[PDB]
Subunit: 87 residues, 4 copies
């Protein structure tokens, strides 16, 4: 998958955020204690990661502390060769 | 801290030691490297965007005329934030 | 520190929330969970062997009569060591 | 793979240990700064991990500091079902 979302926030939100991640269609996530927890979620699309982030921040970030980071893969260099069997 | 920048390099196995040395010289925090038998894949963590670009430019300029590979980068940006700190904590 | 004990659980997707709650209650440091569509795989880190066994026993006793799964553990032991410390460092 | 070796040691040994890992037949490794570096190596067999550890400690651990940890997977519980298409 070409996109990664990271959410660092208060431990109290663990179950509520895990449920958002499940409902989003994401294939999995990592969560670790880091008073605070850090989620990492890989997504096939940019939009899926943005939508998780919107749902979490709109629901919780007026009342709870947290930070959400996103990245999308950008190809910098490429050199490819293939033939009939290998393409 | 912001998450580390991630650089991924997929290329020919023969370049393993030369690329590992480039990664070390750049000041990267670390990397994973795996066979993916003819090919290897590096996933490299760097503190800054500039350090990841240094590795990418060094590898591609030196080798990508003669060897096959792909290099991509994932650099985190803040999308939402809500933080508090006081006398002991900032 | 010794590396964390690793517990891996592969089982049916429907148990996702019940197992995540067991992992949290046990005091584990964290976990990864991934679809592996019908099945999920947890990889869980725990500070102690006892904490990983607690999760394993809780999950298998509660669910493994009725649901399919496998649970395995990897607990690190020291094989070789050579360490030095002095006044500032021990 | 069912076995994991972890080596924590002095940064000066980075290239020498990476070369041992390559020569062992292992499929890959992770290495991170942790003055010190930490290697993680997954191996298909217990013997492969032990052999990496022996080679590193015999060569270096009289003169350099480090620690090497090993684990092998132990199945605790299992319940399997399959039919003609799925076994
Ligand atoms: Na709120
Ligand atoms: Na020595």
């Amino acid at each position: 998958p070409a996109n990664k979302l990271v959410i660092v926030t208060e431990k109290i939100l663990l179950k509520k955020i895990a449920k958002i991640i499940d409902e989003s269609g994401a294939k999995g996530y990592t969560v670790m204690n880091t008073a605070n927890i850090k989620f990492e979620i890989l997504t096939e699309t940019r939009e899926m990661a943005e939508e998780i982030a919107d749902r979490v921040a709109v629901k919780y970030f007026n009342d709870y502390a947290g930070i959400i980071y996103i990245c999308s893969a950008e190809v910098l260099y490429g050199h490819t060769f293939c033939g009939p069997e290998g393409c």
